[PDB]
């Protein structure tokens, strides 16, 4: 109260000083009980690859990825590479290919090669890529007879749209069918390197999910109910109590949403029940004092909470179950304004001295000592 | 096998308050949800046929069939219907459904008697044989075919009706529950059916949906439809 009012003397009255909040006690995480590991040897190391204009998908699905082994062979999009290791999803889409040194930045969510004309990487890309430079190992002139580059067509394609037709296309003033002319060209030419193919490994991560099959290397813990806990359900972090919902979820539904843009309920990844996301109890703190000219004894009102959701046992609150750094008080009384700690309730009615709420007022009277 | 048939002029009918499906997988209950999505416009002109004409697929098609028994046994989806691009075929063969994405090569008038739908099924890339989508002129079947980038969403409903047989697509409301979510990466611009018949087209509109205590839609209002609805 003194630091809020910026004074060493406090007048008589009730003062709103801080907010009562409850710490999470257990820090729990819930992942599906999987014991598999990702075979990254097939991911990083291979000898034959598909083309720059028609690449394929070696999808590593249902395999628990670890990203500390990334540098055994970078650019990263969507999620920064320090925290791909805690995300959870269902499938990993592999989108690997080969490139040229003048094409190292043209297959991207942003920046301009044959991939924009025959098979394209999306701009809304939520995966992380690996930039491997393989001239110093695979030393040769021609990469492959199936690796070819071109300059333009008459129209661009969508991401993952495949059209590898070998025909002259027209951006000029006349149609051409095997005819050279103004913007009638067939620029599809094969690679010829000088001192050597280069290779990129892409792992696209999906959205709009089923219940998740793949997680990070974090070890899941036990489920704690009816207490304020710090939870993590398949990447969904938060703090609150986990009670049973009694909600009619369909089996393909994994999350329930309230009025606001947040999650109200979540399906447990292991035991498949439905748990409410209810944040643990809080309220304003009101400090009732008769004035530092009169006394230093104060009473504390925790607004809008029960007397069971508040620190009552002041001798065991050095273990910090609450965001309140201290805990004082002797007498505990329940008021519709909140749980009042520090004032002894009497059955005698007096004129209102310090208002609290719902017909209850506080005063500093003689009972014989002052309290 | 190609077989010769008789061409007829089309008819038109009213849509009433019919053609509302579940837009998302999130289970909302006891609310009023404002959504901006593909829907059939209310009180629109639904094209009514009795033949099997080749119709466009203008970004989602509401389909309905009123019949006594199993007559219309499936659908055909694609851009071109020769052996040049891939296409989708759904056949409700008596005790099963066969769903194929292949290259295909159809005849001019595909129909079910025997099987004369196509001639070749080279390079089959998706197949799904399961419980037939068709269920139970008393029978009414509703479907919504929505081709989003990556997915082909079919929504369905089956209803025993007792109305007048011509010009009487019945008034009332029935939400169309999701039936199947095909993971097909093909372009779809045109569709055909296999042998009443109703085809309406979806448009991006704004709807107000009423979610009850059981999570089932029981009322839908279109602001665009009327100022009071707005």
């Amino acid at each position, epitope marked *: 109260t003194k630091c809020t009012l910026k004074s060493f003397t406090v007048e008589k009255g009730i003062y709103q000083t801080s907010n009562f909040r409850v710490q999470p006690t257990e820090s729990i995480v819930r992942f599906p*009980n999987i014991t598999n590991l990702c075979p990254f040897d097939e991911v990083f190391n291979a000898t034959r690859f598909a083309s720059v204009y028609a690449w394929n998908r070696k999808r590593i699905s249902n395999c628990v990825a670890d990203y500390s082994v990334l540098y055994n062979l970078f650019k990263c999009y969507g999620v920064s590479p320090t925290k791909l290791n805690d995300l959870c999803f269902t499938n990993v889409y592999a989108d690997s290919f080969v490139i040229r040194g003048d094409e190292v930045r043209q297959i991207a969510p942003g920046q301009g090669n044959i991939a924009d004309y025959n098979y394209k990487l999306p701009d809304d890309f939520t995966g992380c890529v690996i930039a491997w430079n393989s001239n110093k190992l695979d030393s040769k002139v021609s990469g492959n007879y199936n690796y070819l580059y071109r300059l333009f067509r008459k129209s661009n394609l969508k991401p993952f749209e495949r059209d590898i037709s070998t025909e002259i296309y027209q951006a000029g003033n006349k149609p051409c069918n095997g005819v050279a002319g103004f913007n009638c060209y067939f620029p599809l030419r094969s690679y010829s390197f000088r001192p050597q193919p280069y290779r990129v490994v892409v792992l696209s991560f999906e959205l709009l999910h089923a219940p998740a099959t793949v997680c990070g290397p974090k070890k899941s813990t036990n489920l704690v109910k009816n207490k304020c806990v710090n939870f993590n359900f398949n990447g969904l972090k938060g703090t609150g109590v986990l009670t049973e919902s009694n909600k009619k979820f369909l*089996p*393909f539904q994994q999350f329930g949403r309230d009025i606001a843009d947040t999650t109200d309920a979540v399906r447990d990844p292991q035991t498949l029940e439905i748990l409410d996301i209810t944040p643990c109890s809080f309220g304003g703190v009101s400090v009732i004092t008769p004035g530092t000219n009169t006394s230093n004894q104060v009473a504390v009102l925790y607004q809008g909470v029960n007397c069971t959701e508040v620190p009552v046992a002041i001798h065991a609150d050095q273990l910090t179950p609450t965001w309140r750094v201290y805990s004082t008080g002797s007498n505990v009384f329940q008021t519709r304004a909140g749980c009042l700690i520090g004032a002894e309730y009497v059955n005698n009615s007096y004129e209102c001295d310090i208002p609290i709420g719902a017909g209850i007022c506080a005063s500093y009277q003689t009972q014989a000592s002052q309290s | 096998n190609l077989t010769t048939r008789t061409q007829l002029p089309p008819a038109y009918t009213n849509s009433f308050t019919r053609g509302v499906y579940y837009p998302d997988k999130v289970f909302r209950s006891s609310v009023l949800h404002s959504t901006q999505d593909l829907f059939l416009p209310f009180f629109s002109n639904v094209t009514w046929f009795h033949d099997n004409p080749v119709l466009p697929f203008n970004d989602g098609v509401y389909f309905a069939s009123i019949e006594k028994s199993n007559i219309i046994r499936g659908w055909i989806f694609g851009t071109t219907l020769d052996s040049k691009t891939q296409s989708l075929l759904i056949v409700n063969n008596a005790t099963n459904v066969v769903i194929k994405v292949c290259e295909f090569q159809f005849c001019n008038d595909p129909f079910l008697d025997e099987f004369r739908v196509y001639s070749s099924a080279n390079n089959c890339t*998706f197949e799904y044989v399961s419980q037939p989508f068709l269920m139970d002129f008393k029978n009414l079947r509703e479907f919504v075919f929505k081709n989003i980038d990556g997915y082909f969403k079919i929504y369905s409903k089956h209803t025993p009706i007792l109305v007048r047989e011509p010009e009487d697509l019945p008034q009332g409301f029935s939400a169309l529950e999701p039936l*199947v979510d095909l993971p097909i990466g093909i372009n779809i611009t045109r569709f055909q059916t296999l042998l009443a018949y109703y085809v309406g087209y979806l448009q991006p509109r704004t709807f107000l949906l009423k979610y009850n205590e059981n999570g089932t839609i029981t009322d839908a209002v279109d602001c665009a439809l009327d100022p009071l609805s707005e």
Partner: antibody, heavy 129, light 111 residues
Framework: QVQLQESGPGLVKPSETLSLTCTVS??????????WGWIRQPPGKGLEWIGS???????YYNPSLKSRVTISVDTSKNQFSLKMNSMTAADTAVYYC?????????????????????WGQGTLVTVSS | QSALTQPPSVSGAPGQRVAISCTGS?????????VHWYQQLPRTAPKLLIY???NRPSGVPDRFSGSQSGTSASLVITGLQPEDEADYFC???????????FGTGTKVTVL
């Protein structure tokens, strides 16, 4: 010619380790790309479902078997394994391997129904002893 | 979730119509979708006998079928055979839990 062979021991004490293996006899039908399940039937009681697996993942479990024990499919060896670790006293029963329905190719679909069509012979396990 | 009410037994006099039924809630059978009946001879695997509320698989004869309508599903068996003395089970797909609920069974006895 669709037959389902089943294997697994039949007598354990409570808190013991056991596993049931289900193999395909060799028919291409009910071999690789199908939905699968296990059915438990107590002696003197009716059928009741315990286990089901859909494509690679997407496992649905009985409320009795929700976190009780897991299930696995080795697709290449046509092996359908249901672990049986530390069973409670009510699991003395005959167990059946069963294919649902539905061939599917190359993708991961989303169907809202279920089946059981072909059934194994059934293996008896005793745990109340 | 299940609510599956099924009679325990019914008279199985041969050459005579036997109608059996199971009724659940309005979430699995009342959706008019995915209810199966299984036939189980004693010491024999319970094969899939009829599916799709009336749809008959390969090998199952005629005059012996299903008549589901709404919340109640029912089999009609006209002309009971001596090989049809078995136990008949239901199975329905619910949307709230998908617990794949089964019936208690109707053990037919011939006389």
């Amino acid at each position: 010619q669709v037959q389902l062979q089943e294997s697994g021991p039949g007598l354990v004490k409570p808190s013991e380790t056991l596993s049931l293996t289900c193999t395909v006899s060799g028919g291409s039908i009910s071999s690789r790309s199908y939905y699968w399940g296990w059915i438990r039937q107590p002696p003197g009681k009716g059928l009741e479902w315990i286990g089901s697996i859909y494509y690679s993942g997407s496992t649905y479990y009985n409320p009795s078997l929700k976190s009780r024990v897991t299930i696995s499919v080795d697709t290449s060896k046509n092996q359908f394994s249901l672990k049986m670790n530390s069973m409670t006293a009510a699991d003395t029963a005959v167990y059946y391997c069963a294919r649902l329905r539905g061939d599917e190719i190359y993708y991961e679909s989303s169907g809202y129904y279920s089946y059981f069509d072909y059934w194994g012979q059934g293996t008896l396990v005793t745990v109340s002893s | 979730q299940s609510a599956l009410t099924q009679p325990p037994s019914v008279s199985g006099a041969p050459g005579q119509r036997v109608a059996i039924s199971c009724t659940g809630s309005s979430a699995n059978i009342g959706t008019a979708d995915d209810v199966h009946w299984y036939q189980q001879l004693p010491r024999t695997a319970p094969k899939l006998l009829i599916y799709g509320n009336n749809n008959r698989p390969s090998g199952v004869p005629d005059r012996f079928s299903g008549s589901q309508s709404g919340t109640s599903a029912s089999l009609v068996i006209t002309g009971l055979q001596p090989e049809d003395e078995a136990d008949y089970f239901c199975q329905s797909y619910d949307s709230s839990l998908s617990g794949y609920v089964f019936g208690t069974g109707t053990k037919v006895t011939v006389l």
